[PDB]
Amino acid sequence: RFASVYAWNRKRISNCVADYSVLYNSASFSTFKCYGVSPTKLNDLCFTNV
């Protein structure tokens, strides 16, 4: 259960280690869209804000 598109919900994640490799390997999502940053890059890249 999640909020509507008009009432979009934003959650700050901090002080945790983030890996997108597991999410990409599963490939559960039918489509993947990346613009400013890209998936292969997310694994090596370190992001201050999630």
Binding site: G36, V37, S38, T40, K41, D44, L45
Partner: peptide, 14 residues
């Protein structure tokens, strides 16, 4: 460019 630094573009983009 999105970033002046060449390295910043390389790190965030394919």
């Amino acid at each position: 460019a999105i970033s002046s630094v060449l390295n910043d573009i390389l790190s965030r983009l394919d």
